C-alpha cells in the first residue's frame, strides 16, 4: 500500500 513509499522513490 502507501507504506511501500517509505521504502523507495517512485520516478
Amino acid at each position, epitope marked *: 500500500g502507501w*507504506l*511501500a*513509499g*517509505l*521504502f*523507495y*522513490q517512485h*520516478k
Partner: antibody
Amino acid sequence: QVTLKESGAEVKKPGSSVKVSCEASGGTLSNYVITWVRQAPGQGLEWMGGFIPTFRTAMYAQGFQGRVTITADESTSIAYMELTNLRSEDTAVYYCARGPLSRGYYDYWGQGTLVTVSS
Amino acid sequence: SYVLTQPPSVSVSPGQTARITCSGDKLGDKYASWYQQKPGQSPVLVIYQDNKRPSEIPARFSGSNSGNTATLTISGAQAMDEADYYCQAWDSNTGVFGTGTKLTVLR
C-alpha cells in the same frame, strides 16, 4: 560515519533458526530504513527485506515472507534479523544496511555475518 | 520475477573508461543505484538516483539510466577500482540487485 556492527559468524543445523544482531555505533536507526541483504559464497547480493523502527513497518521479499523477521530495540539502537527453517542454501554472509526514508538506496553497511547451515 | 542483467566480466586498460551496463525491463522508469564490493569487504554505495554521487565518491564515477539500461561509468580507471559492481532498482515492492560484474584492470 555511522558504524553498523554485526554479531559473530555461526554454524546452524538445517531446520533450525538464526538471529543476527546489527548495532548502530555513532548513530541512530530511528527515522531510517534498516535492511538485510545476503550473499552466498561466490554469488551475488540478495535483498531480504526492510524495516522502519519509527513507523514499526517491515517489507519482506516475497520469497522470504513467513520465514524472516526484522526487529529493533529503541534504547540500544540495535536491529535484529531472524531467519527460521534453515536450509543448506541459507549458507551466506548476512549484511545489515541503513538508508534514508522514501529512498531505496543504502549508504551504510555492516561488516557482514557468515551463517553456515550444516549437519 | 524481475531480472537485472549485467555482463559477468568487464576489462579496462588503466586510464581508460569502464562502462558497466545493467539491463532491465522498465529500467528507465526506475531509480537505479550502484554498489562497489571489493574482495572480502562490504558493499559501498557509488551512485544513487541514477546519477547522484555520495560525498566520499570520486567524480570519475558517473551514472545514467535510459529506456531498458542503466550504466555505471568509471573514467580514468585505476587498480583502486578492481571490484564487483552491482546495480539495484525496485520492482513490485522489492529491492532487486543486478547479476554483478567483476571489473578487471589490465596491467
